[PDB]
Every structure is written in structure tokens, then in C-alpha cells.
Amino acid sequence: SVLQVLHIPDERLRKVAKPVEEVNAEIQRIVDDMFETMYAEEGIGLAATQVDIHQRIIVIDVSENRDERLVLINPELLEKSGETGIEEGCLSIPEQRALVPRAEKVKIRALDRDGKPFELEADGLLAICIQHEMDHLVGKLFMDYLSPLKQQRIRQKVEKLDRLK
Ligand SMILES: [Fe+3]
Structure with missing residues (x-):
């Protein structure tokens, strides 16, 4: 299912997500709905x-062919x-859109969709995307x-766009 993405202003976007306790079927289903939502809304x-689920779950796909699913559950910046x-x-x-300062390279550790820990070193667009998603949590x-x-x-600009609906 495609979930509703919250837009500013919305105080729920300022909540601190809690860590996922266990990667079970329910968490996998959230990961799957998040990818469906991300692709439907054309994001990377x-x-x-952002979909009002306050747990440390991120989905990313920065690939040209939209076939490289990265899942970051409980990510930690190393x-x-x-x-x-x-x-x-x-x-x-x-x-x-606006230019924002970011680290050029990052190394993180997280759990994948199967609950398996892994480490990832990233640079370029992927490093920026990881930092932007971790900030949301x-x-x-x-x-x-x-x-x-x-x-x-x-x-003010977003409020206007959303008023025009
Ligand atoms: Fe975002």
C-alpha cells in the first residue's frame, strides 16, 4: 500500500523515532509499504x-534503474x-529545494529487511541521501x-501549494 506522506508544517515530522525492537513480519510489511510509497511519490x-511511523526505519533507492533497494533499520553513523x-x-x-552542507563520505551500520546487521560505506549522492534520511528519524x-x-x-510556499490542493 502507498502511505500518506506528511508535509510541513506538521509536528509529527519533529518526533524522535524509537529503535525497532525486532525485525518481524510487521516490520517487513512497513518496509515494503515504504518502498511502494517512495516509488509512487518519485523519491530516492x-x-x-514521514509516514507517521515513529520507528527507526529508512528505505533508499538512488539507482538509475530503480532496482537497488537499500533498507536501513536502526542505522548508526560510524x-x-x-x-x-x-x-x-x-x-x-x-x-x-536548497543547498545544505553534508559530509561527503559516511560509514554506517544497520539491519536489513531480514534483520541482518551490515555495514555500508557511501559517497556522492548515496552519502547525502543517507544523512538526509537519518536526520528525519x-x-x-x-x-x-x-x-x-x-x-x-x-x-509559506508549501502551505500555499497544499491550499491549492
Ligand atoms: Fe526528506
Whole structure:
């Protein structure tokens, strides 16, 4: 099922997700609905927080052919290095983009869809996407890195778009 993605302003986007206690059938079903939602909404990443499920679950697919499913359950950042930035967008901040500072490379550890631990080193777009999704799980959005004024304008623009429905 395609789930509803929350849009700012919405306080549920600021909630801190709790760790997943056990990767069971129910968690797998959430992972699956999150990928369905992410693809339907044309995204490359989605955090559970964005679909009002406050557990540490992230789905990502940054591949050209949309066939490389990465699942990050209970991810932990182990190392990071460098600095970089691209104009990021967000499914919860429709049609707004802004350059945000990010580490260029990251190394994380997480559980996959089977509950198996794995480590992943990433750079480029994937490193940026991982940081953006991990920020969502602790209630942080990319606009938070921008000036107060820019944040105001972003919020006002999204509210307008959503009013036009
Ligand atoms: Fe996002």
C-alpha cells in the first residue's frame, strides 16, 4: 500500500523515532509499504517518521534503474568525512529545494529487511541521501540548515501549494 506522506508544517515530522525492537513480519510489511510509497511519490529515500511511523526505519533507492533497494533499520553513523552539498528536495517539503552542507563520505551500520546487521560505506549522492534520511528519524529536516527567513519562505510556499490542493 502507498502511505500518506506528511508535509510541513506538521509536528509529527519533529518526533524522535524509537529503535525497532525486532525485525518481524510487521516490520517487513512497513518496509515494503515504504518502498511502494517512495516509488509512487518519485523519491530516492523515505524515513518512517514521514509516514507517521515513529520507528527507526529508512528505505533508499538512488539507482538509475530503480532496482537497488537499500533498507536501513536502526542505522548508526560510524564515521564521516569531507564536506559537500547539493540542492536537496524532500517529499515532506513539496517542490522546494536548497543547498545544505553534508559530509561527503559516511560509514554506517544497520539491519536489513531480514534483520541482518551490515555495514555500508557511501559517497556522492548515496552519502547525502543517507544523512538526509537519518536526520528525519531524529525530527530534523533539511530546511533546518537554512536561515530563519528561508525557512519561513519555504513553509509559506508549501502551505500555499497544499491550499491549492
Ligand atoms: Fe526528506
